[PDB]
Amino acid sequence: SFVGLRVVAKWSSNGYFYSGKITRDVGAGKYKLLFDDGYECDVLGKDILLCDPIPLDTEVTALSEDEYFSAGVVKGHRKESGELYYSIEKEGQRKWYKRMAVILSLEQGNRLREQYGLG
Amino acid sequence: SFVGLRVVAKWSSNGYFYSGKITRDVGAGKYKLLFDDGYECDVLGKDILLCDPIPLDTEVTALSEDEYFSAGVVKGHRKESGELYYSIEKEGQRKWYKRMAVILSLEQGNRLREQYGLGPYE
């Protein structure tokens, strides 16, 4: 099944896609998610990307203390104490971001559906 | 030490206060905060509430697929497998929320500063 797999899944409240894992196959195209931000809810399979890690050169939306969710490009990956960080380039400068600080806008997630969508 | 203590701290980027733990004294009256949502950053001690659990009868803000950042009042606490859940009352009805799903609006957190503030300058 898809239970236990890492995904980037749309939260329909605002349309962005967020990293997490599928915890249950509910049936009829519905899955239960545990997002990395701790949120738990059901998400439809058509809005789940089976994409992990987010690939190098993907356009993403990333949070830091100086940037409230602005666009950047993935230029690296690092695991430290089992946790994934992304190196994201914005206006020619790079910083490391925790997995939960890297999301996809609706347009950015849509770009990945054909290749990575469940479905 | 404050390292390891559970707190509820204002995040200046959007004004709400969120649950987490102090992980480091970074000096300058600031502490590193690992929020329960997984985010890490430095926060002024003056903006940290030493408040755990969030007390009964506190007005809070809850998030679920049925409650969109809605105001409610803490009417219960439950610990199961070491995890804390809150029972929040709104319009006479109560639902259980996990810890990350209960936050404080700017006003809701501001209310608690005098009583629960870390108080780095006392």
Ligand SMILES: CCCC(=O)c1ccc(N2CCN(CC)CC2)c(F)c1
């Ligand atoms: C109005 C309160 C502050 C605010 O703007 C806000 C808080 C939490 C949010 N969530 C991220 C997605 N996650 C689910 C993956 C749930 C929590 C969010 F989208 C916005």
Ligand SMILES: CCCC(=O)c1ccc(N2CCN(CC)CC2)c(F)c1
């Ligand atoms: C751009 C869409 C909005 C959104 O996805 C979002 C995600 C995480 C947020 N934060 C909540 C507080 N947390 C602890 C301080 C940091 C993360 C938030 F306020 C909003």
